[PDB]
Amino acid sequence: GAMNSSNYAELFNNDIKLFVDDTNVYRVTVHKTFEGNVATKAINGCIFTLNPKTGHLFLKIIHTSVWAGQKRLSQLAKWKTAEEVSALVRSLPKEEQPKQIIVTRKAMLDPLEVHMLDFPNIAIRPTELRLPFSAAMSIDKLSDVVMKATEPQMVLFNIYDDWLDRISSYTAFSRLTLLLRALKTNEESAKMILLSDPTITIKSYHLWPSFTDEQWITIESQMRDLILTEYGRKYNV
């Protein structure tokens, strides 16, 4: 059943699993028409499919052309997500196929279950965790590949860079969720914290800066401070 704070270690065991987040699949700008009505213009989106143990990210870029002449796009977006996740699983060798897929939003359960009928032994699960994967488009290199796409494309990343050389999956996931929660709560401030010191760079083959173990502790501390402040404001407490 549902993935929660009680069964959290299960994410880092040796059963292959993927998180699927569909919150950046269908993206629009809302604008006024010449006649003073409101219309949307779609922009490029992405499915965020992540192995939390390895850091492997299957970023399926959703080009605006997939919406052309379609109706009920927020509904179609869930089915297109389920179609592309199902295609990804069938593309993987058997020994690489997940045993579980955890969807970050419960509305993805029926679309993914129906698309995966051919895979009765792959469990489709919701989560009670409030995961910040919507903030994936605040990672400059992920935002850049989505916005530049001129056709449907899959791009493979490791969202943990080289962190697993020094830390466990559990600690890597905690760092990722903290960085994404910060970027989601106050993007400007979070991005200031990550680049303020010009001497720490992002390798060409990485997403995040090359922090030493000591600099990560300072960074992680600055992110937690950012999140609590914002929280006091949101609620006046």
Binding site: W79, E83, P111, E113, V114, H115, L117
Partner: protein, 300 residues
């Protein structure tokens, strides 16, 4: 007008015959039911005064043989049996009638209720859902599970209703996942009507039989089947016009007949709200929507 004689009534019992029911006292000189209308299936059903647990009963059609009831003190129930000797049977019935030991099937001339509940129900279809091929009549009770319930455990005592499952390869064509899930017309019209049932009459017969088993026996799996067959039609954008008009009549008489006090357990809130207010056919069941709104406005 046919007769189901009773050898005796050794235990106190409420006896149902279709939508009617009568209390019989322990060792009361009761010898059966006469004037049963020819042309319809019938159900004769029982609830013991000392164990209101296990409603049970028998589906039969008097055109198919001479049937009687006899209490079995070993198995502790009223059993249906066939009398193969025509002259013995005629002689038993004539004697019990002469002594006026039989209740009369109490049909009002104006009253089409039983016809309306059993319009598509055929004994030959009942005998394929309820498998006991050595008898011409079919036993059902409160506890019997369906083939679908057993998949999710004695196969011989199962209700073999047609399995309907909206998230099954049978229901969903590869490449039409979203289309087939949101519009079940493929599943209704090709898989179920053309494929399995052959025609809408057999589909309606099974729907009506599932309802009557839910109502008369509180059979939970029958109730699931009745709702699944309703939801498959209401969730199809493309249904023949005659089928929608007939479904409205079927459901109207079912809702009209349901005991007011059993709507809490026998009616699924989700299915009815979806069927009457959200589905493709939300505007196609006028009679049913009006009786549901006037009789069970709480459920909705």
């Amino acid at each position: 007008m046919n007769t189901v004689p009773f050898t005796s009534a050794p235990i106190e019992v409420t006896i149902g015959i279709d939508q009617y029911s009568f209390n019989v006292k322990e060792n009361q000189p009761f010898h059966g039911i006469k004037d049963i209308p020819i042309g319809h299936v019938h159900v004769i059903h029982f609830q013991h005064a000392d164990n209101s647990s296990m409603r049970y009963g028998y589906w039969f059609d008097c055109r198919m043989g001479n049937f009687y009831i006899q209490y079995d003190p070993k198995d502790g129930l009223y059993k249906m049996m066939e009398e193969r000797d025509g002259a013995k049977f005629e002689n038993i019935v004539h004697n019990f009638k002469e002594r006026q030991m039989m209740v009369s099937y109490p049909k009002i001339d104006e009253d089409d209720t039983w016809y309306n509940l059993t319009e598509f129900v055929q004994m030959d279809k009942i005998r394929k859902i309820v498998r006991k091929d050595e008898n011409q009549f079919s036993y059902v009770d409160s506890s019997m599970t369906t083939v679908q319930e057993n998949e999710l455990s004695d196969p011989a005592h199962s209700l073999n209703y047609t399995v309907i499952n909206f998230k099954s390869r049978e229901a969903i064509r590869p490449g039409h996942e979203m289309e087939d899930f949101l519009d079940k017309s493929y599943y209704l019209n090709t898989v179920m009507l053309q494929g399995i049932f052959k025609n809408s009459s057999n589909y309606f017969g099974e729907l009506q039989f599932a309802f009557l088993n839910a109502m008369f026996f509180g059979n939970y799996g029958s109730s699931l089947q009745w709702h699944a067959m309703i939801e498959l039609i209401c969730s199809s954008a493309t249904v023949p016009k005659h089928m929608l008009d007939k479904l409205d009549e079927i459901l109207y008489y079912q809702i009209k007949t349901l005991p007011e006090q059993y709507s809490d357990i026998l009616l699924n809130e989700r299915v009815w709200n979806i069927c009457l207010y959200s589905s493709f056919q939300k505007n196609s069941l006028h009679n049913t929507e009006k009786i549901m709104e006037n009789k069970y406005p709480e459920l909705l």
